[PDB]
């Protein structure tokens, strides 16, 4: 009954806003245009978008938030879903960001 996540690999390069992930040998794997979560801290996460799956398993991420806290060697978890944002009438009258955070 644990809230298991899915680790895919580790951050390798951080070229400003873009970044790269090295796969962990024999780990699940990631998909295209999906949202990954870099573990900046054991409890906090930063969002990235998959943009390029390479022949060597290296993943190409476009970082979205908390880009200053992203450091190479940090574990990356996979959501396995395309970016879904909160929508409806409960979001009216509010100021949000592209990730849906208020």
């Amino acid at each position: 009954f644990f809230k298991t996540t899915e680790m895919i690999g580790y951050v390798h390069s951080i070229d400003g806003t873009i970044a790269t992930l090295i796969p962990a040998p024999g780990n699940p794997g990631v998909a295209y245009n999906t949202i990954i979560q870099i573990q900046v801290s054991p409890t906090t996460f930063a969002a990235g978008l998959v943009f390029n799956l390479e022949k060597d398993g290296r993943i190409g991420i476009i970082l979205m938030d908390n880009i200053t806290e992203v450091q190479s060697g940090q574990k990356v978890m996979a959501t396995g879903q395309l970016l879904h944002i909160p929508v409806g009438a409960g979001v009216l009258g509010k100021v949000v960001n592209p990730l849906g955070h208020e």
Binding site: P25, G26, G57
Partner: protein, 136 residues
Amino acid sequence: YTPPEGLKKLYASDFENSKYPLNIVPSDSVLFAKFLYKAAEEKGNFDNILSDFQKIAAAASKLPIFWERTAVVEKIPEFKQLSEPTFFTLVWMQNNGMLELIQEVAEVYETFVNAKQKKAVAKIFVAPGGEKNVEE
């Protein structure tokens, strides 16, 4: 160097396309792991090569900073104790200028062995000095 005849023959075959316990995406560090696995499989002793990597790591700490840039495993005294398949790979890496992938190669080789030996390794990440209690 005098490669043993056995390693010469495997080095000539297209072992990269052979069947393996797991379908790992091709990579530079993966090619060596596949080679060592096949060479070890023929000899029937996977463990020895794993043990050799543990001495390679221990020796590396004693070698000078940025040794992989200037190293010649033939000249290094410590690497003489390594196994024949293990030493062949190091020379092969050195000629290709990829001696810095030794750490990466070791993990893959373990994964193939674990898949073949049917072992599952769970990484327990703990705080520095907090590894005393791992009961949970």
